[PDB]
């Protein structure tokens, strides 16, 4: 059984690997297909155990990944794409 | 299909000059235009993409600009190794298309041709025909007039010329003319000559051989 | 280092079929689409189409959908172009070219190209060349006259690659006989005539005819 | 920069620690407040790189953790609550 | 091991105030709510309320909000029950009791209780007892008479806890003087009277009187 | 406030008997009822919660059932150590409330008391008052009569008794009777006697002493 202290420390507001849908991030990439379609990004996640607070990022950063782009009938290749990471999170008022 | 028209089709400019080549598209293509350089006997090589991105390794003297339906390639200071045919290519809409190409010739100090004349090699004559080769080594400008005369009778119609591509180092041409005859009526003559009428030449130079000298 | 090596070109009869191969190396074949581009002798560039090397889907420029077929063998990192019912107008140098590694956004330009292979469509038969000497006698000009051969191309080096400078191999010309003819010239120091040996190495892969001719004054 | 192979492996459909909200799993616990309000559970996450597919669990399990319950005006204490973890995930048609 | 130790009980004048403490140990004080229950002499159990030890919020059964107040000092793992304007009916043993570790669902029952402390409200005065021997003389009997004390309670053990079998400490009786009195007795083997030492350990906390009295044949 | 009423209020049963105690709520409380056992001088201890969950460590002879407004606690086989007061407690609506309690007494065979009489100590005499104690040890049932006689004068009104809670191992009671005398009156007489009457005694038993012997 998981001890309360653990459950608590492990689920409290903090940057946690989140699989983000690339098309979501770049909503403009309408006509492209991506491989992978999603990426592993450090992101604010967890709880504040306070209806009045909320987990938000206080320190952001960028990560660059090799993503294959595909625009059907036109082309296909890998290349570099950058994504926003969250390095610091904190529980702040809503 | 989107049409790409380059202008001019060809040009001559001197080393150090600033050359501008233009590509105009039959419809708007945003900044989706690339430019290539192709030298004789080789695959084209990308100079610029997305209208102005200089490809890694490409001399900065090469620059491109423009937008919509009009673009420009600019070579800021022509070098002798910049002799080549340049192409633009749109990637707005498939099928990808290229402009017709612009040939760039380097303009240099006029130069006189080094004439030479060769005679029908023995064992070829023993085949049933004689080919007489007249050489015009390293010169400028390209235009030149090689005339064949067999025993004063100025030949006309049995010759074929072939010219070298602009030299990448010194920018000169080399030409070769060939009068073809039958080993039959070749043995039937004596003095053979090819007169080189060039501009770097003050008087039409001639070369000749002694049938069996 | 990235590089594309093509093969499979050559002489083919009208109505005949041919299959070109483009072998990728120095990178991961499935990561960049492969394009095919042809250039008729002395003409412009024409895009045939491209094939997605990750999914295998081909896209043809309209004029080629009917007779051309792209396929690949990822296990060999090789793209193929299959041409059927060839015509004289399909005579050209065929290149393969890979799409580039982008930065942020995509731009469809061709960054690495193969060396191209010449495909010549004709019912004329293969014929090796007859190399003759164009003997010499400050500096003198000597050479070889490669005569009556089909189809292009013919290669010509001097002293097996030794004699570089002073060499000028001319563009072949189609003789009224339907055969090609070209001359390869070189200029050497006049005081070399009796001293150094001059042999032009003519090669004609189409007929596997490789001639070696010793050129000396007569 | 992250190599395509990694980006690819790392985001491909699989069980990944997810910070799950308790009232979510137990929609019936209206009148309770929990600490933490969310727990760290293995859950199917990632992409299939196929519009027609979807990441789903093929092998589930249960995890038991010490969660403090609080019913205002009534009582407060820690104790044992069990949650569903995903052990196996697979891309299957929709 | 889990345990709740209460202190602060005793005599208090009508109208007066008193603070009781409940000291927890052997577990995490803030993870379980603390209840307060009282039981008047010879009567039933009455829930006073409880306080959330994680958040601090107190909840009182109606009759108590007015004069009682629950508080905590988490840094000492202690809960407090402050009582004001006490009246004779507030006379009772007061217990603190923690809520239990649950399994899946919550049930509000009290699982560990403190030992309870007697709060007696009265204007009489505190008075320590006099301890006299009930000298002995098969089985023999002996004991200690703990006379004239106030208020309750008094504690009596034998030989510091080592002797518990055969022991009977009687319920205190209110004398017509308003002071309590009780006897504590034990039966022992007669043959042991010359040799074994018998000491009753008396403790009357309200007046801080502690007495160890040796009881022997006269 | 929800009212819990138990019944009976008290009962006496023999070791081995099945005992059932009843809790009746003033309104539906679902299965939110608990049961506690409280021994003399100790805090109550939980036996059962949520109507029927047996708390860890509780003998399985204890069981609870019921629902709505009627509940029942059952001891399948009464043991000597089950002497205690039992309470039910609802946790349906705050404030939590308890039943009035059911005292369970053990019924056993008759046991005559062992009787002992004790003179006041000289140390107490120093203070002006004398206490004479008579002890009735380990008897059953509770009913017992103690009579005091000083030099054969029956004492009335100057003594007080206290009785022990049922012993949890042997189920008996013990009683102490204390006769209060002034030091002066105590020195005025010689024979001090307590006479005990009890069901297990065929005839009354008397214990006495002579002041100073």
Short mmCIF file of N, CA and C in Angstrom, two decimals, chain E residues 85-184:
data_model
loop_
_atom_site.label_atom_id
_atom_site.label_comp_id
_atom_site.label_asym_id
_atom_site.label_seq_id
_atom_site.Cartn_x
_atom_site.Cartn_y
_atom_site.Cartn_z
N UNK E 85 -17.19 28.97 32.58
CA UNK E 85 -18.43 29.05 33.34
C UNK E 85 -18.94 27.68 33.72
N UNK E 86 -18.07 26.85 34.25
CA UNK E 86 -18.47 25.50 34.63
C UNK E 86 -19.52 25.49 35.72
N UNK E 87 -20.42 24.51 35.64
CA UNK E 87 -21.48 24.35 36.62
C UNK E 87 -21.40 22.92 37.13
N UNK E 88 -22.08 22.65 38.24
CA UNK E 88 -22.07 21.33 38.84
C UNK E 88 -22.38 20.20 37.88
N UNK E 89 -23.22 20.46 36.88
CA UNK E 89 -23.59 19.42 35.92
C UNK E 89 -22.48 19.14 34.91
N UNK E 90 -21.42 19.93 34.95
CA UNK E 90 -20.32 19.69 34.03
C UNK E 90 -19.33 18.71 34.64
N UNK E 91 -19.60 18.33 35.89
CA UNK E 91 -18.77 17.38 36.63
C UNK E 91 -18.81 16.03 35.87
N UNK E 92 -17.66 15.58 35.40
CA UNK E 92 -17.61 14.35 34.64
C UNK E 92 -16.18 13.95 34.30
N UNK E 93 -16.03 12.72 33.81
CA UNK E 93 -14.73 12.25 33.32
C UNK E 93 -14.79 12.66 31.84
N UNK E 94 -13.74 13.29 31.38
CA UNK E 94 -13.68 13.78 30.02
C UNK E 94 -12.64 12.96 29.28
N UNK E 95 -13.03 12.44 28.12
CA UNK E 95 -12.14 11.64 27.29
C UNK E 95 -11.91 12.30 25.95
N UNK E 96 -10.72 12.08 25.40
CA UNK E 96 -10.48 12.49 24.04
C UNK E 96 -10.40 11.11 23.34
N UNK E 97 -10.78 11.05 22.06
CA UNK E 97 -10.76 9.80 21.31
C UNK E 97 -10.62 10.04 19.82
N UNK E 98 -9.58 9.42 19.25
CA UNK E 98 -9.29 9.56 17.84
C UNK E 98 -10.14 8.72 16.90
N UNK E 99 -10.38 9.25 15.71
CA UNK E 99 -11.12 8.53 14.69
C UNK E 99 -10.16 7.43 14.19
N UNK E 100 -10.70 6.37 13.58
CA UNK E 100 -9.93 5.23 13.07
C UNK E 100 -9.45 5.24 11.61
N UNK E 101 -8.44 4.41 11.34
CA UNK E 101 -7.90 4.22 9.98
C UNK E 101 -9.02 3.45 9.28
N UNK E 102 -9.51 3.95 8.15
CA UNK E 102 -10.59 3.25 7.48
C UNK E 102 -10.13 2.32 6.33
N UNK E 103 -11.06 1.53 5.82
CA UNK E 103 -10.75 0.64 4.69
C UNK E 103 -11.80 0.90 3.65
N UNK E 104 -11.39 1.59 2.58
CA UNK E 104 -12.27 1.95 1.48
C UNK E 104 -13.28 3.04 1.77
N UNK E 105 -14.04 2.85 2.85
CA UNK E 105 -15.09 3.78 3.26
C UNK E 105 -14.96 4.24 4.75
N UNK E 106 -15.63 5.34 5.09
CA UNK E 106 -15.56 5.93 6.43
C UNK E 106 -16.66 5.59 7.42
N UNK E 107 -16.26 5.22 8.63
CA UNK E 107 -17.20 4.92 9.70
C UNK E 107 -16.73 5.66 10.92
N UNK E 108 -17.60 6.53 11.42
CA UNK E 108 -17.27 7.38 12.55
C UNK E 108 -17.50 6.74 13.91
N UNK E 109 -16.50 5.96 14.32
CA UNK E 109 -16.47 5.30 15.61
C UNK E 109 -15.14 5.73 16.26
N UNK E 110 -15.07 5.65 17.58
CA UNK E 110 -13.85 6.07 18.26
C UNK E 110 -13.02 4.85 18.56
N UNK E 111 -11.81 4.78 18.03
CA UNK E 111 -11.06 3.59 18.31
C UNK E 111 -10.01 3.67 19.41
N UNK E 112 -9.29 4.77 19.58
CA UNK E 112 -8.39 4.80 20.74
C UNK E 112 -8.80 5.98 21.61
N UNK E 113 -8.91 5.73 22.90
CA UNK E 113 -9.34 6.71 23.87
C UNK E 113 -8.24 7.03 24.83
N UNK E 114 -8.30 8.23 25.40
CA UNK E 114 -7.32 8.60 26.41
C UNK E 114 -7.83 7.91 27.67
N UNK E 115 -7.12 8.04 28.79
CA UNK E 115 -7.56 7.39 30.01
C UNK E 115 -8.70 8.13 30.72
N UNK E 116 -9.02 9.36 30.28
CA UNK E 116 -10.05 10.20 30.90
C UNK E 116 -9.56 10.93 32.17
N UNK E 117 -10.00 12.18 32.44
CA UNK E 117 -9.68 12.88 33.71
C UNK E 117 -10.98 13.44 34.28
N UNK E 118 -11.15 13.26 35.58
CA UNK E 118 -12.31 13.70 36.31
C UNK E 118 -12.24 15.21 36.61
N UNK E 119 -13.24 15.94 36.15
CA UNK E 119 -13.30 17.35 36.42
C UNK E 119 -14.43 17.44 37.44
N UNK E 120 -14.16 17.95 38.64
CA UNK E 120 -15.26 18.08 39.58
C UNK E 120 -15.46 19.57 39.91
N UNK E 121 -16.68 20.03 39.69
CA UNK E 121 -17.00 21.43 39.88
C UNK E 121 -17.63 21.59 41.22
N UNK E 122 -17.02 22.38 42.07
CA UNK E 122 -17.59 22.52 43.39
C UNK E 122 -16.84 23.60 44.11
N UNK E 123 -17.47 24.19 45.12
CA UNK E 123 -16.75 25.24 45.84
C UNK E 123 -16.04 24.70 47.07
N UNK E 124 -16.16 23.42 47.35
CA UNK E 124 -15.44 22.86 48.50
C UNK E 124 -13.95 23.05 48.23
N UNK E 125 -13.12 22.77 49.23
CA UNK E 125 -11.68 22.95 49.11
C UNK E 125 -10.88 21.64 48.93
N UNK E 126 -9.74 21.72 48.25
CA UNK E 126 -8.91 20.53 48.03
C UNK E 126 -8.34 20.08 49.37
N UNK E 127 -8.27 18.76 49.57
CA UNK E 127 -7.74 18.18 50.80
C UNK E 127 -7.12 16.83 50.54
N UNK E 128 -5.89 16.65 51.00
CA UNK E 128 -5.16 15.42 50.82
C UNK E 128 -5.55 14.43 51.88
N UNK E 129 -5.48 13.14 51.59
CA UNK E 129 -5.85 12.12 52.57
C UNK E 129 -4.77 11.78 53.58
N UNK E 130 -5.19 11.05 54.62
CA UNK E 130 -4.30 10.50 55.65
C UNK E 130 -4.39 9.02 55.29
N UNK E 131 -3.28 8.30 55.36
CA UNK E 131 -3.28 6.88 55.03
C UNK E 131 -2.99 6.07 56.28
N UNK E 132 -3.89 5.16 56.64
CA UNK E 132 -3.65 4.37 57.82
C UNK E 132 -3.62 2.90 57.45
N UNK E 133 -2.91 2.09 58.24
CA UNK E 133 -2.81 0.65 57.99
C UNK E 133 -3.98 -0.16 58.56
N UNK E 134 -4.35 -1.21 57.83
CA UNK E 134 -5.37 -2.18 58.27
C UNK E 134 -4.45 -3.42 58.39
N UNK E 135 -3.93 -3.58 59.60
CA UNK E 135 -2.98 -4.61 59.96
C UNK E 135 -3.56 -5.99 59.98
N UNK E 136 -2.82 -6.94 59.43
CA UNK E 136 -3.25 -8.34 59.36
C UNK E 136 -3.28 -9.00 60.71
N UNK E 137 -4.03 -10.10 60.78
CA UNK E 137 -4.19 -10.98 61.96
C UNK E 137 -5.51 -10.78 62.70
N UNK E 138 -3.33 -20.56 56.09
CA UNK E 138 -4.51 -20.03 55.39
C UNK E 138 -4.22 -18.67 54.81
N UNK E 139 -5.29 -17.93 54.50
CA UNK E 139 -5.18 -16.59 53.96
C UNK E 139 -5.39 -15.54 55.04
N UNK E 140 -4.64 -14.45 54.94
CA UNK E 140 -4.76 -13.35 55.88
C UNK E 140 -5.20 -12.19 55.00
N UNK E 141 -5.74 -11.13 55.60
CA UNK E 141 -6.11 -9.95 54.82
C UNK E 141 -5.44 -8.72 55.41
N UNK E 142 -5.11 -7.75 54.56
CA UNK E 142 -4.53 -6.49 55.05
C UNK E 142 -4.86 -5.38 54.07
N UNK E 143 -4.60 -4.14 54.46
CA UNK E 143 -4.92 -3.05 53.56
C UNK E 143 -4.53 -1.70 54.12
N UNK E 144 -5.05 -0.68 53.46
CA UNK E 144 -4.80 0.71 53.79
C UNK E 144 -6.12 1.46 53.75
N UNK E 145 -6.32 2.35 54.73
CA UNK E 145 -7.52 3.17 54.79
C UNK E 145 -7.06 4.53 54.34
N UNK E 146 -7.66 5.04 53.27
CA UNK E 146 -7.30 6.35 52.73
C UNK E 146 -8.46 7.28 53.08
N UNK E 147 -8.27 8.02 54.17
CA UNK E 147 -9.28 8.90 54.73
C UNK E 147 -9.21 10.42 54.57
N UNK E 148 -10.40 11.01 54.47
CA UNK E 148 -10.61 12.45 54.43
C UNK E 148 -9.94 13.23 53.33
N UNK E 149 -10.32 12.94 52.10
CA UNK E 149 -9.76 13.67 50.98
C UNK E 149 -10.85 14.26 50.12
N UNK E 150 -10.45 15.20 49.28
CA UNK E 150 -11.39 15.83 48.38
C UNK E 150 -10.61 16.62 47.34
N UNK E 151 -11.03 16.54 46.05
CA UNK E 151 -12.15 15.77 45.49
C UNK E 151 -11.62 14.40 45.10
N UNK E 152 -12.46 13.65 44.39
CA UNK E 152 -12.01 12.37 43.86
C UNK E 152 -11.09 12.77 42.69
N UNK E 153 -10.25 11.86 42.20
CA UNK E 153 -10.08 10.47 42.65
C UNK E 153 -8.78 10.21 43.36
N UNK E 154 -8.67 9.02 43.93
CA UNK E 154 -7.46 8.61 44.59
C UNK E 154 -7.03 7.34 43.91
N UNK E 155 -5.73 7.11 43.86
CA UNK E 155 -5.22 5.91 43.24
C UNK E 155 -4.52 5.01 44.28
N UNK E 156 -4.73 3.71 44.20
CA UNK E 156 -4.01 2.86 45.12
C UNK E 156 -3.51 1.63 44.40
N UNK E 157 -2.21 1.32 44.57
CA UNK E 157 -1.63 0.09 44.02
C UNK E 157 -0.85 -0.52 45.18
N UNK E 158 -0.42 -1.76 45.01
CA UNK E 158 0.31 -2.49 46.04
C UNK E 158 1.69 -2.93 45.52
N UNK E 159 2.70 -2.69 46.35
CA UNK E 159 4.08 -3.01 46.04
C UNK E 159 4.47 -2.47 44.68
N UNK E 160 4.05 -1.25 44.41
CA UNK E 160 4.36 -0.59 43.15
C UNK E 160 3.83 -1.31 41.92
N UNK E 161 2.73 -2.04 42.06
CA UNK E 161 2.16 -2.68 40.89
C UNK E 161 2.50 -4.14 40.79
N UNK E 162 3.47 -4.58 41.57
CA UNK E 162 3.89 -5.96 41.56
C UNK E 162 2.84 -6.90 42.18
N UNK E 163 2.04 -6.40 43.12
CA UNK E 163 1.01 -7.21 43.74
C UNK E 163 -0.34 -6.73 43.21
N UNK E 164 -1.02 -7.58 42.45
CA UNK E 164 -2.33 -7.20 41.90
C UNK E 164 -3.37 -8.29 42.16
N UNK E 165 -2.93 -9.52 42.34
CA UNK E 165 -3.89 -10.59 42.58
C UNK E 165 -4.42 -10.53 44.01
N UNK E 166 -5.71 -10.77 44.19
CA UNK E 166 -6.29 -10.71 45.52
C UNK E 166 -6.52 -9.28 46.03
N UNK E 167 -6.29 -8.27 45.20
CA UNK E 167 -6.46 -6.89 45.60
C UNK E 167 -7.88 -6.35 45.34
N UNK E 168 -8.44 -5.61 46.30
CA UNK E 168 -9.76 -4.98 46.15
C UNK E 168 -9.68 -3.55 46.67
N UNK E 169 -9.73 -2.57 45.77
CA UNK E 169 -9.71 -1.17 46.20
C UNK E 169 -11.14 -0.73 46.07
N UNK E 170 -11.80 -0.45 47.19
CA UNK E 170 -13.22 -0.07 47.18
C UNK E 170 -13.60 1.31 46.63
N UNK E 171 -14.83 1.43 46.10
CA UNK E 171 -15.29 2.72 45.58
C UNK E 171 -15.31 3.66 46.80
N UNK E 172 -14.94 4.92 46.61
CA UNK E 172 -14.91 5.89 47.71
C UNK E 172 -16.31 6.19 48.22
N UNK E 173 -16.42 6.52 49.50
CA UNK E 173 -17.72 6.83 50.05
C UNK E 173 -17.66 8.26 50.54
N UNK E 174 -18.72 9.06 50.32
CA UNK E 174 -18.74 10.44 50.81
C UNK E 174 -19.13 10.37 52.28
N UNK E 175 -18.29 10.90 53.15
CA UNK E 175 -18.59 10.89 54.57
C UNK E 175 -19.54 12.05 54.86
N UNK E 176 -20.22 12.01 56.00
CA UNK E 176 -21.15 13.09 56.31
C UNK E 176 -20.40 14.40 56.50
N UNK E 177 -19.07 14.37 56.46
CA UNK E 177 -18.26 15.57 56.61
C UNK E 177 -18.01 16.23 55.25
N UNK E 178 -18.37 15.53 54.18
CA UNK E 178 -18.17 16.08 52.85
C UNK E 178 -16.81 15.69 52.29
N UNK E 179 -16.12 14.81 53.01
CA UNK E 179 -14.82 14.34 52.58
C UNK E 179 -15.01 12.87 52.21
N UNK E 180 -14.20 12.38 51.28
CA UNK E 180 -14.31 10.98 50.86
C UNK E 180 -13.40 10.11 51.67
N UNK E 181 -13.66 8.82 51.62
CA UNK E 181 -12.83 7.86 52.28
C UNK E 181 -12.96 6.50 51.60
N UNK E 182 -11.83 5.79 51.49
CA UNK E 182 -11.84 4.46 50.89
C UNK E 182 -10.80 3.53 51.50
N UNK E 183 -11.03 2.25 51.30
CA UNK E 183 -10.12 1.25 51.76
C UNK E 183 -9.67 0.45 50.56
N UNK E 184 -8.45 -0.05 50.63
CA UNK E 184 -7.89 -0.91 49.61
C UNK E 184 -7.40 -2.11 50.41
#
